[PDB]
Design an enzyme around this catalytic site. Structure first.
Site, PDB file in Angstrom:
ATOM      1  CE1 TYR B 509      37.213  45.576  45.739  1.00  0.00           C
ATOM      2  CE2 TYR B 509      35.967  45.548  43.887  1.00  0.00           C
ATOM      3  CZ  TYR B 509      36.347  45.182  44.975  1.00  0.00           C
ATOM      4  OH  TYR B 509      35.950  43.501  44.914  1.00  0.00           O
ATOM      5  CB  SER B 592      39.145  42.357  46.902  1.00  0.00           C
ATOM      6  OG  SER B 592      38.624  42.778  48.479  1.00  0.00           O
ATOM      7  CE1 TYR B 593      40.295  45.254  39.188  1.00  0.00           C
ATOM      8  CE2 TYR B 593      39.290  42.876  38.985  1.00  0.00           C
ATOM      9  CZ  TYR B 593      39.609  43.671  38.160  1.00  0.00           C
ATOM     10  OH  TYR B 593      40.055  43.960  36.891  1.00  0.00           O
ATOM     11  CG  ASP B 670      40.856  35.167  52.244  1.00  0.00           C
ATOM     12  OD1 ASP B 670      39.883  35.040  51.560  1.00  0.00           O
ATOM     13  OD2 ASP B 670      41.394  36.485  51.782  1.00  0.00           O
ATOM     14  CG  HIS B 702      38.675  38.745  51.042  1.00  0.00           C
ATOM     15  ND1 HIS B 702      39.975  38.519  51.110  1.00  0.00           N
ATOM     16  CD2 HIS B 702      37.661  39.279  50.965  1.00  0.00           C
ATOM     17  CE1 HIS B 702      40.004  39.988  49.844  1.00  0.00           C
ATOM     18  NE2 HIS B 702      38.717  39.904  49.821  1.00  0.00           N
TER      19      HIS B 702
HETATM   20  C1  GVB Z   1      28.078  43.363  51.077  1.00  0.00           C
HETATM   21  O1  GVB Z   1      29.681  44.224  51.111  1.00  0.00           O
HETATM   22  C2  GVB Z   1      29.883  42.941  49.806  1.00  0.00           C
HETATM   23  C3  GVB Z   1      29.243  41.764  49.096  1.00  0.00           C
HETATM   24  C4  GVB Z   1      29.570  41.087  48.207  1.00  0.00           C
HETATM   25  C5  GVB Z   1      31.305  41.695  47.736  1.00  0.00           C
HETATM   26  N1  GVB Z   1      31.742  40.574  46.204  1.00  0.00           N
HETATM   27  C6  GVB Z   1      30.993  40.077  46.199  1.00  0.00           C
HETATM   28  C7  GVB Z   1      31.355  39.499  44.610  1.00  0.00           C
HETATM   29  C8  GVB Z   1      32.677  38.788  44.322  1.00  0.00           C
HETATM   30  N2  GVB Z   1      33.017  37.852  44.761  1.00  0.00           N
HETATM   31  C9  GVB Z   1      33.506  40.228  44.841  1.00  0.00           C
HETATM   32  C10 GVB Z   1      34.584  40.664  44.832  1.00  0.00           C
HETATM   33  C11 GVB Z   1      35.480  40.519  43.697  1.00  0.00           C
HETATM   34  C12 GVB Z   1      36.698  39.821  43.584  1.00  0.00           C
HETATM   35  C13 GVB Z   1      37.781  39.943  44.700  1.00  0.00           C
HETATM   36  C14 GVB Z   1      37.549  39.656  45.468  1.00  0.00           C
HETATM   37  C15 GVB Z   1      37.727  38.618  47.192  1.00  0.00           C
HETATM   38  C16 GVB Z   1      35.477  39.683  45.363  1.00  0.00           C
HETATM   39  C17 GVB Z   1      33.154  40.418  46.038  1.00  0.00           C
HETATM   40  C18 GVB Z   1      32.072  42.522  48.200  1.00  0.00           C
HETATM   41  C19 GVB Z   1      30.600  43.353  49.341  1.00  0.00           C
HETATM   42  O2  GVB Z   1      31.624  44.572  49.433  1.00  0.00           O
HETATM   43  C20 GVB Z   1      33.195  44.541  49.073  1.00  0.00           C
END
Ligand code: GVB
Ligand code: GVB
Ligand code: NAG
Ligand code: NAG
Ligand code: NAG
Ligand code: NAG
Ligand code: NAG
Ligand code: NAG
Ligand code: NAG
Ligand code: NAG
Lengths: 728, 728
Positions: B509, B592-593, B670, B702
């Site tokens: 990640y 994602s990342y 997405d 997503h």
């Molecule tokens: C409840 O689980 C969550 C909540 C928020 C969550 N993030 C919220 C903040 C950011 N948007 C984060 C993110 C960073 C970079 C790319 C992406 C798609 C998502 C994703 C991720 C997540 O599980 C992986």
């Protein structure tokens, strides 16, 4: 022969076919560009000259994309800033250069983003379309004359086709038509107002932060169609103090009943126009014959000369009502019709008279009508040797129909079975261009007494090259299924051995009126699989295929995804039986209609296919367009043919892909078969849990044709079949 | 010789992890559903009474998605017709059940398609948002009063958040906050009037003829952002006829000079609110403290009372600025601040003073403040054994900050090393959830002497079953890069043999402040690859990962795509030089990342990886949302960080992909990480002639989360990995 025909070869065009595209400027002169020189040749004496030099336009400032010299060699038209649109449409910037001076015209330049330009067929007049509106220039260096004012992006189309009309009626962005005089400009006008919009993303350059949404008026099956109007304007009467008067020609009463299309526009004299019309349900066409009325400024269409075509077994024409060829005086024409036995033959029509007399008859069809002198009509057909895969020039004596002479059969029986021809204005001479089975052979003749004047191109240069390559060989027999012969071809691997066992890729299109089993010589992807991978690429022409008469062609009517499908399977099950094909390794690929079929084939439970690729397929008819689909399928309504729209989806077979390996490909920016249809395929394959491989081509349209993307798909597909077959 | 943990097992959730969700009702009782009853328990003596019988609403006509009970007794809300929007947002319908009668309220219902609903923290008042406008109910049978009239779809958002705020700011749809009384109701307003729109197709059921174009206001890196005002209404003055008076709270002067976000709203006392605002350049953060004025009916935030956070090192807080926990009287509060040595510890601030006092120090970090009392603060840190990847509950007496007890450390040191916690009002009892490394353990405890009371759920059911399968074991250790410890874990096959040479899957990640190496027990896809496919799945927290102080976390400041990528490569190399990882089989993947990094790695030329899989990656930072990206990257202008935004795209590296085998997956719906992103990647990989695998998912988003798409994507990925590794 040591070297092999190679994937890079196909992709990078190692071996180019030479052509001879000439443009006739009279009864005994053609133009021909040589590299970049433009040369005029005398057909009679073969002597020629530099008409325009390749160097003439060096300090011009914009890469020149095409010319178009006026029909009096007085002015040349220069096409630059070419931006493509759909399959024929585009926009371009133009300049007019005077040939009697060393001079581009400065004054009143054709404006940028012109959707269409055309000379008159006589002198130096211009019609062009700018912002969906028609303009007219008598003299190249004069202020233009506006002819319409109603034009509006995506809504009103004057003198140009909308999407459906471009792709599915006119095969042309053009909806203009000069009278031979150059007196009269006739034109269509489409009203796209309530035509729903297909929408999809175009991502563009990386640098583009937010993707653009492309929106195009596109009637899918059953939706609202564009409406059409016809008009005739008089160029010699144009005033610049006054607006111009179009004169509306209206459609036959029996068309105004419901939706309909203007399908054919053929001028007949300096004063007579032939319009055809097709009812939305495409089994009723009406021809009208309209004459000018020099006293009232009107056009009149007398019911007395109105003619009707109506299919009882399917639809009219091959894809539309045929083109009618008009005898000089204007009072009779010939046009290809489905005879009483289902076959397409030349028919003779006299303007105020009933019925027509057929001049040709038999178990073959005419492909087209090519020229008409006073004693003879010239035409291409597939009569010779009963080969529906073939094409040849014939000539008929008009005062006795029974006197036909095959002008081309016998010029080179081994290299030549597929011709096309280009008659000189007034048919004094003709370019014959053979297309196979051997290398393209471009000749030149004279009608007088058919005397072979001159070879123009023989591909000797390529013929020498291809001797170093272990080329595939092409087989072209046929099978019997009921009592009927259906034709198939096989591109066979070099040093073929019928003792050994070979992988078979079934190369399909099989849409309505198709022919994938011919004598044409082709250098393509199948050429590679065969030469380098020793893979037998077969094709087959079964139910719904063309040129064998309505009993085969119309078997598919209101019924797509049925016979055409089953029959591909059947062909395979035959090939399999044959001793040189390993049945554990049969594949199937296809693009457009072909990709539709492949998927249906794979989802059939056949047992016969290991794998297949399908490229930008149709998946559900309600997604594809009205003019094409409804020609074949009727309307998606409960009272017409909805049931079968629902019986014939790729989606409903999905469960069956459990038993095969599937590769599905689509270009995201395909305005034609929209990504939707593939998108719907993948979802169903997902819902029901079946594994399959995929590939999208961001920004690629229906062709997937940009040189980079093109190389990509054939590579990817090559790996897939190579892996599916166990090929190292 | 037992069975093994299989894809099926994972996909169909054969072995389930049992839970004990509760909601404290007071300082002594809590709610719990047991065989569909809603129970109230007594924490003190264990005894339970039936609050809502499983029988009731067997005859409701609708399936009920969630329930929600008045703080003070008498009503319960019924949530049905739930329709998911984004990650937290959704639409639904509601009935109120009056508990003092077998009765639903008939009159004056909450409207269908409601955006958000909340009880007040006391009584039975309702605040709801509907069509982006705020409505308040003093009793549930009375007509609601309307607070805002300005809500306009996709434009003005009263009491709900928009896409960015939802995703990146409040991790919430709700933009509502009651006072503890239930007297006032503060809410934010969002104005997206000029925010650009991302658009993409949704294809829906195969019966949808024409694709719907979805348009979502979504500020991409450097785009115009939404604006926010903030309001507070007295709910105890509402009139049936005269509109409600929302008093505005103005951002501070030093936020009002440029773009800014509201990023935290905490009530302090009945008459005092705490607002944290945050500059668009996430460097600088102000907390504002506002008292209510009995006389003026206005709210005032004394300047001298403002509290500023800066950072030269990166951005303020882990993801946003941290949350203040106030003392009962509301004249002081505790809050996690990064200290002088970069470490996150607890700080005591006094309202009308200006500095703070650190209450914890060390080479570990405080994860969260869990509960505060006259006597005790309670928090969670990774102090125990210096394992940054574990979590324990700790306790400070406030009369002496050195007097610190751990409460979870020694409960079962082998079994439990990852706690979260849940305190009754006034921290009189607490529920402890240990999430690993053993099977999760749920306990109840007494605050008085920190005594054990009862075991809630001990997953002994899972334990029985797991004894029958060949479970992978976990290694959680560290390595050294430039004199710094960095942590990784490995999911090791059973009967691990250190002289065999297993294939490694790198699970990445690596986004700013992530942690993939930790003490938690997961049953996931790694489980299956280890137990069945004999694949070490390893993760590693390199530079830019959090919970180990700012030197590591902020290393990535203004330069994503860099050290987090090197450091992933380095890890793999050191995994190489262990006699149990065969270096010819190193794969990598992330979502994602995870995919940006996977992708960046695969294209670094390290040639240390055979293959990877990138799931819905970022590919160019200019495509992702303003709040997230600009936090870590600044703006994409030439005056800021344009250069780096460019250096750090997947696209720039398309050439190296020649070396590796790629698999690019993305869903088409997405809303978060737009398909655009993967579309641009493949356009790059096509432009330069690199074969690769891809897979779009029609209409998924997503999380590719729907039951069929989840089962699919994992199937696909398993085929690709097994084949990458010669695994049949
Ligand atoms: C409840 O689980 C969550 C909540 C928020 C969550 N993030 C919220 C903040 C950011 N948007 C984060 C993110 C960073 C970079 C790319 C992406 C798609 C998502 C994703 C991720 C997540 O599980 C992986
Ligand atoms: C000039 O080359 C053409 C013209 C038209 C043409 N077709 C016109 C009629 C149909 N639109 C046909 C087609 C395309 C895509 C899907 C389907 C079902 C049919 C494609 C094909 C073609 O080369 C393959
Ligand atoms: C196209 C061409 O050059 N044709 C020539 C023509 O120019 C010339 O008038 C004639 C007399 O020799 O020969 C022929
Ligand atoms: C030929 C013409 O008039 N059109 C324009 C020309 O004036 C201009 O120099 C250029 C920039 O638009 O593009 C072309
Ligand atoms: C100067 C001139 O002739 N222009 C008119 C135009 O303004 C009008 O809109 C149109 C109506 O048909 O006719 C033309
Ligand atoms: C309710 C509200 O604040 N609406 C505003 C509007 O007045 C203004 O013109 C616009 C500029 O984007 O911002 C929005
Ligand atoms: C086109 O059609 C619409 C309705 O179908 C009509 O209202 C409009 O005026 C038409 N425009 C022209 C110029 O034909
Ligand atoms: C537990 O038992 C006591 C004694 O009867 C009672 O007062 C209390 O209400 C019970 N708790 C619950 C959950 O009702
Ligand atoms: C809400 O939905 C129901 C259908 O479930 C309908 O009967 C009702 O009239 C709708 N309107 C309201 C009350 O908002
Ligand atoms: C509800 O509760 C009863 C008894 O409390 C339990 O035994 C039964 O299985 C449950 N039934 C439902 C509706 O889930």
């Amino acid at each position: 022969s040591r070297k092999t025909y190679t994937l890079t070869d196909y992709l990078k065009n190692t071996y180019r076919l030479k052509l001879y595209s000439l443009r006739w400027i009279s009864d005994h002169e053609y133009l021909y560009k040589q590299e970049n020189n433009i040369l005029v040749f005398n057909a009679e004496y073969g002597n020629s000259s530099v008409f325009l030099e390749n160097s003439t336009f060096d300090e011009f400032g914009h890469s020149i994309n095409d010319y178009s010299i006026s029909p009096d060699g007085q002015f040349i038209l220069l096409e630059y800033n070419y931006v493509k649109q759909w399959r024929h449409s585009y926009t371009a910037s133009y300049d007019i250069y005077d040939l009697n001076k060393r001079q581009l015209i400065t004054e009143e330049r054709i404006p940028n983003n012109t959707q269409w330009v055309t000379w008159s067929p006589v002198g130096h007049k211009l019609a062009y379309v700018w912002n969906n509106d028609i303009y007219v220039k008598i003299e190249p260096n004069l202020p233009s004359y506006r002819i319409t004012w109603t034009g509006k992006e995506d809504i009103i189309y004057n003198g140009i086709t909308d999407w459906v009309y471009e792709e599915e009626v006119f095969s042309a962005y053009s909806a203009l038509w000069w009278s031979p005089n150059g007196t009269f400009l006739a034109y269509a006008q489409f009203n796209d107002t309530e035509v729903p919009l297909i929408e999809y993303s175009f991502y563009s350059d990386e640098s583009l932060q937010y993707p653009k949404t492309v929106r195009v008026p596109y009637p899918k099956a059953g939706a609202v169609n564009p409406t059409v109007k016809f008009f005739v304007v008089n160029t010699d009467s144009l005033s610049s103090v006054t607006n111009a008067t179009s004169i509306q020609i209206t459609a036959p009463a029996s068309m105004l009943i419901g939706d309909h299309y203007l399908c054919d526009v053929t001028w007949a004299t300096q004063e007579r126009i032939s319009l055809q019309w097709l009812r939305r349900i495409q089994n009723y066409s009406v021809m009208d014959i309209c004459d000018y009325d020099e006293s009232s400024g009107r056009w009149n269409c007398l019911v007395a000369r109105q003619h009707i075509e109506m299919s009882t077994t399917g639809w009219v024409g091959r894809f539309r009502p045929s083109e009618p060829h008009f005898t000089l005086d204007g009072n009779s024409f010939y046009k290809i019709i489905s005879n009483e036995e289902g076959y397409r033959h030349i028919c003779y029509f006299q303007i105020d008279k009933k019925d027509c007399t057929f001049i040709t008859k038999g178990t073959w069809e005419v492909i087209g009508i090519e020229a008409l002198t006073s004693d003879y009509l010239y035409y291409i057909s597939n009569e010779y040797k009963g080969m529906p895969g073939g094409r040849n020039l014939y000539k008929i004596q008009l005062s006795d129909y029974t006197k036909v002479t095959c002008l081309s059969c016998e010029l080179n029986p081994e290299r030549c079975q597929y011709y096309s021809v280009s008659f000189s204005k007034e048919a004094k001479y003709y370019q014959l261009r053979c297309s196979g089975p051997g290398l393209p052979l471009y000749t030149l003749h004279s009608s007088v007494n058919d005397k072979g004047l001159r070879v123009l191109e023989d591909n000797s240069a390529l013929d020498k090259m291809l001797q170093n390559v272990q080329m595939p060989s092409k087989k072209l027999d046929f099978i019997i299924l009921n009592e009927t012969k259906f034709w198939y071809q096989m591109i066979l691997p070099p040093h073929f051995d019928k003792s050994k066992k070979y992988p078979l890729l079934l190369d399909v299109y099989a849409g309505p009126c198709s022919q994938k089993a011919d004598t044409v010589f082709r250098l393509n992807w199948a050429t590679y699989l065969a030469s380098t991978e020793n893979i037998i690429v077969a094709s087959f022409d079964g139910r719904g295929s063309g040129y064998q008469g309505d009993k085969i062609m119309h078997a598919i009517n209101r019924r797509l995804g049925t016979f055409e499908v089953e029959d591909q399977i059947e062909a395979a099950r035959q090939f399999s039986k044959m001793g040189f094909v390993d049945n554990k390794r049969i594949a199937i690929w296809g693009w457009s209609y072909g990709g539709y079929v492949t998927s249906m084939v794979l989802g059939s439970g056949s047992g016969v296919f290991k794998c297949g690729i399908a490229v930008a397929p149709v998946s559900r008819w309600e997604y594809y367009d009205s003019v094409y689909t409804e020609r074949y399928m009727g309307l998606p309504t409960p009272e017409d043919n909805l049931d079968h729209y629902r019986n014939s989806t790729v989606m409903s077979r999905a469960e069956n892909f459990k038993q095969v390996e599937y590769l599905l490909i689509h270009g995201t920016a395909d305005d034609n078969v929209h990504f939707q249809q593939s998108a719907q395929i993948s979802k169903a394959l997902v819902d029901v849990g079946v594994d399959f491989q995929a590939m999208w081509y961001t920004d690629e349209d229906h062709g997937i044709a940009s040189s980079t993307a093109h190389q990509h798909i054939y590579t990817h597909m090559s790996h897939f079949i190579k892996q599916c077959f166990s090929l190292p």
